[PDB]
């Protein structure tokens, strides 16, 4: 019965049409250092073939620099460590 259950945009169409549109998220998902894209588009045709949310099973990541005593070093950090693994 559930025609489409895209978790990228949380669009579920039971044939009901449910779409959650979280406001807090940066334009670019690759890094947080990007404008805040408030616009949201939900093309049903395209969706039935640039994500906004994050899947529960998906654990994104981005590389960031760190400097303590020596030289700047790049280390990976997960945007949702709870999903990855008080």
């Amino acid at each position: 019965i559930v025609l489409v259950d895209n978790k990228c945009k949380c669009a579920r169409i039971t044939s009901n049409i449910r779409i959650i549109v979280p406001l807090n998220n940066r334009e670019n998902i690759s890094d947080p250092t990007s404008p805040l894209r408030t616009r949201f588009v939900y093309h049903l045709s395209d969706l039935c073939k640039t994500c906004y949310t994050y899947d529960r099973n998906k654990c994104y990541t981005a590389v960031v620099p760190l400097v303590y005593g020596g030289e700047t070093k790049m280390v990976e950090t997960a945007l949702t460590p709870d999903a990855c693994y008080h």
């Binding site: 489409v4 049903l44 045709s45």
Partner: protein
């Protein structure tokens, strides 16, 4: 009344994470400021260790700036090996022992980072923005923090951080606090600030949060969502 104080510098979590080495030193200050000072180290097993050799000592100006670099692998400290330092002086025959070790056994718990922007009152005052990055419900101690603006790093004196103090509800656990103060122009411009922190209990050992002017309690949304082809093919 000359008070002979003694200090000891053990390793740090940031050192093991980046330098992956060990650095333990012990010195005495607030006493006769000159050379001819006796210091020695000995592991838990009683064996010798890397003694201070070719290391800096008190300057000729009675400036006590001695340092130490114990070339010992991080694993030995990780086990919490009992390093005993014996500080003695020519005019102080009495011995003075200092035992340093890692506490064996702790209820490791993941940290809980947060980020809050400058209060509306401070921003309205237009004197200096302040951003808070706190870490609650985490143990053990020795957590490093760093701050970054627009991806690039930032100087240490541009921000301050608190030590891990005991927590009210969780005396075993501790909490840390960091404040970054800047002008009222970068944050007002919309600078996306980021706070990184490295704790042992964390799985990845590193985490971060971020916030900019808009994400800092958006005074107003500008949502303009459009739902093209509400029904077609799919439904």
């Amino acid at each position: 009344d000359t008070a002979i104080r003694v200090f000891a510098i053990p390793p740090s979590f940031a050192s093991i994470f980046l330098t992956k080495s060990t650095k333990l030193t012990c010195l005495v200050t607030d006493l006769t400021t000159y050379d001819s000072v006796t210091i020695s180290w000995t592991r838990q097993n009683g064996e010798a260790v890397k003694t201070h050799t070719n290391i800096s000592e008190s300057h000729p100006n009675a400036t006590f700036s001695a340092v130490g670099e114990a070339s010992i692998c991080e694993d030995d400290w990780n086990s919490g090996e009992r390093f005993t330092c014996t500080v003695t002086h020519t005019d102080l025959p009495s011995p003075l022992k200092q035992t340093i070790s890692r506490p064996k056994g702790v209820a490791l718990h993941r940290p809980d980072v947060y980020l809050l922007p400058p209060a509306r009152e401070q921003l309205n005052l237009r004197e200096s923005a302040t951003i808070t990055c706190l870490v609650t419900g985490f143990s053990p101690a020795d957590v490093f923090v760093q701050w970054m603006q627009r991806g690039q790093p930032l100087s240490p004196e541009k921000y301050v951080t608190s030590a891990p103090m005991p927590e009210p509800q969780a005396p075993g656990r501790y909490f840390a606090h960091s404040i970054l103060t800047v002008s009222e122009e970068e944050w007002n411009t919309g600078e996306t600030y980021t706070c990184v922190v490295a704790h042992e209990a964390l799985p990845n050992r590193v985490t971060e949060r971020t916030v900019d002017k808009s994400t800092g309690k958006p005074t107003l949304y500008n949502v303009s969502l459009v739902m093209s082809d509400t029904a077609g093919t799919c439904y």
